[PDB]
Amino acid sequence: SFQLPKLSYDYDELEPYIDSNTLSIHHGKHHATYVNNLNAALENYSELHNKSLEELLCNLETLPKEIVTAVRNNGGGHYCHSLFWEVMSPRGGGEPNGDVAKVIDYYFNTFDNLKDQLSKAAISRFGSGYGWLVLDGEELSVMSTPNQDTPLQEGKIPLLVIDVWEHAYYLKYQNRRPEFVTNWWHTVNWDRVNEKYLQAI
Amino acid sequence: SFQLPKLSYDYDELEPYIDSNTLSIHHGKHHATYVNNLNAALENYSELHNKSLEELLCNLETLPKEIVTAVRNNGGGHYCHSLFWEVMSPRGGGEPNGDVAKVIDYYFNTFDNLKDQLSKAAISRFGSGYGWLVLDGEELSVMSTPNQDTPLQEGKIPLLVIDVWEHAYYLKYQNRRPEFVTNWWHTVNWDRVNEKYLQAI
Ligand SMILES: [Mn+2]
Ligand SMILES: [Mn+2]
């Protein structure tokens, strides 16, 4: 039922920021595996077949105990990676544009300050996880999550995410997570972020 | 003044099971960083300068709140990597020997069954962490931990450990964690596992 989304670009089109082999494995093995495991967990619970990915991740307590973890982990993996691919682009980078640029300045004063704060949140996530920009009411804030956990469980709406699982960066950057994060800003699709923000409100 | 331990073997000596680049970075960068951050956290707390690593990690609940996470994470990293290196060897692999082989048969029926159980525990540890063989009273058992957490916390004594942080295996095995686990078995220093068992009594 859940499907692996096609990327908007080819596996070599985020070079040199993200290497081609990594993008192909990260999408075609890691993300594909979360989708397949999510579908396996839900196969035999047809009462859940019409839940959207968001509904599942917003209501994890109410699932059968046999599958809550599988849905948390693989549903999370599906959600997080799907957003990650959407917010990068072969012609991204630079400063925010559109309506969201304005709300960014409102809450962070400058874009450079947002970049500093999200970068710190991502680098400071110990072990596997993500850094996030979220809408919490009218407010923009930065946070991190462990593993494939998401902000939806907390009522916050993701606009932008960076994957700091070691698989996201180890082939090119090895232990140098901060160098990966510095490079990742060059890929950011501010057009798509602005679309996510409008959707959110 | 914790120190990075010397390996018992050169960086190319676990080939072809673990690549030399990985071994060099994993010991010389990752493990070194945990040691350096551990020493940095303890520097301002003179009370603690004579506590052993085992003491620190068995009594986290009592450290200053300003540094407990730093000690858990970096003390953990030094403990876990220090054991990881001593349980592998260029002479390792195969079926267990010595007294521990008899205790393995006693609790698992056969060694092949221990191997299945520990491999499963390592593979199923979602995110970053470790798989362990521990002594829990007189009884030996298999478990996993997240991040740089150890069984000491819980009163159990480590005899053997596998690192399943992605940094342990990504350069050679990428997403194929099961393949990495299969190869790691060819490295196991059963002499050292035996010594750790005898001491655990
Ligand atoms: Mn990922
Ligand atoms: Mn490690």
Swiss-Prot record, chains A, B:
Ligand binding (Mn(2+)):
H26, H81, D163, H167
Q: Mind telling me which GO cellular component terms the entry cites?
A: cytoplasm
Keywords of this entry: Manganese, Metal-binding, Oxidoreductase
- GO MF assignments: metal ion binding; superoxide dismutase activity
SUPFAM superfamilies xref list: Fe,Mn superoxide dismutase (SOD), C-terminal domain, Fe,Mn superoxide dismutase (SOD), N-terminal domain
Q: What is its EC number?
A: 1.15.1.1
Enzyme class at the top of the EC tree? oxidoreductase
Q: Which InterPro entries match?
A: Mn/Fe_SOD, Mn/Fe_SOD_BS, Mn/Fe_SOD_C, Mn/Fe_SOD_N, Mn/Fe_SOD_N_sf, SOD_C_sf
- Is Metal-binding given among the entry's keywords? yes
Function in brief: Destroys superoxide anion radicals which are normally produced within the cells and which are toxic to biological systems.
Query: What does the annotation say about its assembly with partners?
Result: Homodimer.
**Which family is it part of?**
Belongs to the iron/manganese superoxide dismutase family.
Q: What is this protein called?
A: Superoxide dismutase [Mn] 2
Species whose genome carries this gene: Bacillus anthracis
